[PDB]
Amino acid sequence: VSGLANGNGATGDFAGSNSQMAQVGDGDNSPLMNNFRQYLPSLPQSVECRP
């Protein structure tokens, strides 16, 4: 239960949730919340000012 939170891993009966907890993620990168990023509205960029 400590290894499914530290990110060290779990061996036993808690060995199925080691692939469910890889989808959650670690830090800022989350495989689950990066599925939403192929569908982001395309906003224009920033260029210098022309009259």
Binding site: S2, A5, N6
Partner: protein
């Protein structure tokens, strides 16, 4: 106070099992107070961790 030939050894044995079993309960108590040490540590480490991302 006269007694039979085996009674004094039944009375010494019924207090060996008790001290052994009361010895195991102690071992397990101490283990469970170690879980609440791991738990607290974890929580405070996840807080200190988020801080370092956000301020960056």
């Amino acid at each position: 106070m006269p007694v039979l030939l085996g009674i004094p050894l039944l009375l010494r044995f019924l207090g060996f099992l008790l001290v052994t079993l009361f010895g195991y309960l102690l071992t397990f108590l101490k283990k469970g107070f170690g879980k609440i040490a791991i738990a607290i540590s974890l929580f405070l480490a996840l807080i200190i961790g988020l801080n370092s991302i956000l301020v960056g």
